[PDB]
Design a protein. Structure first.
Length: 138
């Protein structure tokens, strides 16, 4: 013989207790996370940062075209912060998905390369990128 009783406590107790967690951060710090959400927002808003840095990276390279591995290596190296190589790649495809006139691909019998026009009005790109129509954080 056994049983499994239950009850409910749907009241602002557990809501107000989130205040007290701000003191417990120095004491326990075990699954204690709430204000840390700002990192998620700070990560998703790098949209313009990646676009500007990309342009800069190509500009300083003295060449508007780079090999598949060269641009890849050049982008993944930026991971020396607090993210995986996947988030980098996700950004590469997202950009290209709305920037078919900025970014290009040229497959050659020796290797594959990318083309990028550093004279295109980035401001127009910032807007048409901030549109978030089909991006869904690609």
């Amino acid at each position: 013989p056994a049983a499994s009783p239950s009850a409910l406590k749907g009241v602002s107790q557990a809501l107000l207790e989130r205040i007290r967690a701000k003191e417990v951060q120095k004491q326990l710090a075990r699954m204690t996370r709430c204000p840390e959400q700002e990192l998620r927002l700070q990560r998703l808003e790098r949209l313009p940062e990646l676009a500007r840095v990309l342009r800069n990276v190509f500009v300083s390279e003295r060449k508007p075209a780079l090999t598949m591995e060269v641009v890849c290596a050049r982008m993944v190296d930026s991971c020396q912060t607090a993210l995986s190589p996947g988030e980098m790649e996700k950004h590469l495809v997202l950009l290209a998905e709305l920037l078919p006139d900025w970014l290009s691909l040229h497959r050659i019998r020796t290797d594959t390369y990318v083309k990028l026009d550093k004279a295109v009005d980035l401001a127009g790109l910032t807007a048409r990128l901030a549109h978030h129509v089909h991006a869904e954080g690609l």
